[PDB]
Design a protein around this ligand. Structure first.
Ligand SMILES: Cn1cnc2c(O)nc(N)nc21
Ligand SMILES: Cn1cnc2c(O)nc(N)nc21
Ligand SMILES: Cn1cnc2c(O)nc(N)nc21
Ligand SMILES: Cn1cnc2c(O)nc(N)nc21
Ligand SMILES: Cn1cnc2c(O)nc(N)nc21
Ligand SMILES: Cn1cnc2c(O)nc(N)nc21
Ligand SMILES: Cn1cnc2c(O)nc(N)nc21
Ligand SMILES: Cn1cnc2c(O)nc(N)nc21
Lengths: 121, 121, 121, 121, 121, 121, 121, 121
């Protein structure tokens, strides 16, 4: 199954980070979320109730990205993956990519991040 | 077989959408279409009649994207996939990606959408 | 005097707009603010108290951009100009540019907007 | 007076051009329109009837850009300038920039064009 | 084997095309070439003679892209693939992607093209 | 008079440069040319013979940019300015901007260059 | 006199900033420097000794941008302006623009900064 | 396992290159590094000690990219791969992509490079 639903370049200002200074000042976190979902029925019917509502998916991502400051992006993505997989059965697998385009790293790069793929059980 | 024919960043202004307000004002819909086709003969011959005409493929996408307002992008992509697969036998499979870069979602992201892959039967 | 302080590509999701549908769904408003200020003293001293705090300027723009939905961008910019000019005497003139990159206009363009320049009295 | 109303990166597919081949195949024409207008009243009132409607301005540009194929971009811009200046008295001056990003010129450049500034009489 | 050598966004002005008008005026052709090559020896030694010279690969692409005007991009890519695979044994497979960002197609898209993958025999 | 004719992002690979190594390997030179010309007649008539032919202007720039390797960009721009001003009387003034996006300078920047404005005598 | 020499998008990682946390972690500072210089002689002669060496100008900017952490960007730009104006007499005026694309400001914008223009005495 | 840690668009100015002139003047080298790592524990715990520190990974890349000038990018990437795989056991495989956006190649392209994938033994 190669159908997917996606939300790209989502950006939130948060205060997560392992370094105290990080959590104090904050920074923009960019997030790409790709969900595995079979879209033929919804494509057949044309009824939103046959697919996953992205607005709902964005609010779920936002709630975690703009919430309690944690240390790792790995934690930020695991909570997102695990939260989308719970409330949605049509999502067979959730891929969450988080990027810190401006970390406390002395150099010139486009960004540093992680990406996790999590199947729905 | 890894040969493909493609049309990228296609953009149409339509009025599809589940919310009444959406259909009223409208918005730009971006579409990427990738077709699976064996291009060695056409590459051998150099005769357009040995490959698929993209102009024709674009008109087909345009006709659906600028037509009757439907609810889901899933419906918009299924009709595209199913319409390219019918009129072309050299297309072994059609991939349709639709993106709503500016949906009625309160936030900052690059865009939300879907992507369907459909083999030709 | 050619010194300036600036905030660029500021983006807020609001519900301003002359059309009912607009105010209902909303959209991203991009704002560029350029303030006329003599920066030699601050450049001489290196004391923030000798210049204008942009954070404060951004909060002021944000408060208006994310507040009560009004009709015109002209109103949105006049309130910004008039609000920065009041609380800051070092600002000799305020330029406010607002852009609706995705208005309810059926077409292909990069964006529509306005720009006002207002001297401090 | 430094207030302005603007429409940027407007893009239409037309068939204007001095060379026969040009008019036959066509190409994308990008247009930037900047109008001089005093926006304090509209900024004061918040009444669209105190400013110029861009939708109307875009339709006017579109009608000329997607109409009868002419030779020069200079003609395309003079008709735009002269047409916006007639139907709108609040526009004290109209600036029209047209760009041929892909002309029949053998080389590598970002685009070729013209720009005219026309006061309202 | 996942090592690759690549040349991206290569751009040439040519006159290929099925339509007479096309061949007359011309247009920019963008080309991405990705070659499959085992790079551990060259990575071990650091001797250019243990890998494929891209300059040579670019000249080969250029010679075909700026040569005799043909009809299909499929022909343009097959000649490239077949020409790189002949003169280089370390290339186990050649992928050639050609894009017509501005074809004679009346619309708004980022570009139309093809992509062929060809193993070295 | 605020009318202008322009050619932007023109790019040529040359070997100009004060350092021997520079002239040996070469580099891409980006050029923006803006000419002052009154376009109302051409806008009135629609006759190319009432304006300046950009193709001709591009060939003139190309001939100098892809010719004999000189030392300074200042020399490269003065020859361009002086060559466009001679063969065209409708050009009241020529502005030439040249950019070395990748000079032998150890650092991270978008580019270094010069810009000359030259009136037609 | 409208001739200019320029260095754009220069980027350095520094630790300047009014807030302790800022100086601790650091951030990228983008700098645009535009110098007023008459380039006809250098354009006439083609002798680097008749113009200003940008490499030298970049090293001067770099030395200040990558040096002792100060509070204001206003101080960072005044030292740059004042340092280029001293060692170069052909520079009639120096414009320095500094941008903090990622300041400790909770929001979505492209960047905040200042710009100073300083004549050479 | 599809989890990954990444560093993108990393840019260093070096003097590597097979041609003498290259090593003399230098150029910007862009590097993308993608490491295979299982991130569920770190995602579970939220303890940096359960994942790989990118800062450390960037310093390792920087040390090699800004060190002794070598001939091939293949050598530059093999040393990076082999150096990250040694000091980190959680990295099951390292992918290193290096790009020369501005090589001594006479033409117009976006960049030339290589990419190596190396498993950790
Ligand atoms: C060094 N560092 C700071 N924050 C981090 C995070 O969220 N993940 C990883 N792998 N490293 C981090
Ligand atoms: C919430 N919503 C509105 N339109 C939609 C569409 O076309 N697809 C999906 N999945 N959600 C939509
Ligand atoms: C047509 N229209 C809708 N909103 C507008 C605004 O804020 N300004 C102007 N000039 N026109 C508008
Ligand atoms: C050469 N050429 C073709 N079309 C043109 C136009 O519209 N203006 C100018 N100045 N030149 C043109
Ligand atoms: C319609 N058309 C014109 N040129 C073409 C080409 O090279 N390939 C394909 N598939 N179609 C073309
Ligand atoms: C240092 N350097 C090398 N080439 C140059 C040029 O063309 N102009 C200027 N001002 N400096 C240069
Ligand atoms: C709030 N703030 C922090 N650093 C600053 C700087 O350099 N200039 C200005 N105006 N404000 C600053
Ligand atoms: C031609 N050339 C110069 N440097 C090179 C490098 O690092 N790799 C390859 N394959 N070719 C190179």
């Amino acid at each position: 199954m190669q159908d997917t639903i996606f939300l790209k370049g989502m950006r939130f200002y948060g205060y997560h980070g392992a370094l105290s200074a990080e959590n104090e000042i904050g920074q923009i976190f960019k997030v790409d979320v790709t969900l595995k979902v079979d879209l033929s029925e919804a494509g057949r019917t044309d009824n939103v109730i046959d697919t996953v509502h992205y607005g709902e998916v964005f609010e779920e991502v936002k709630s975690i990205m703009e919430g309690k400051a944690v240390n790792l992006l790995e934690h930020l993505a695991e909570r997102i993956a695990n939260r989308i997989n719970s409330q949605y059965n049509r999502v067979m697998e959730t891929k969450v990519r988080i990027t810190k385009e401006n970390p406390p790293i002395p150099g010139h790069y486009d960004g540093v991040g992680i990406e996790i793929v999590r199947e729905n059980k």
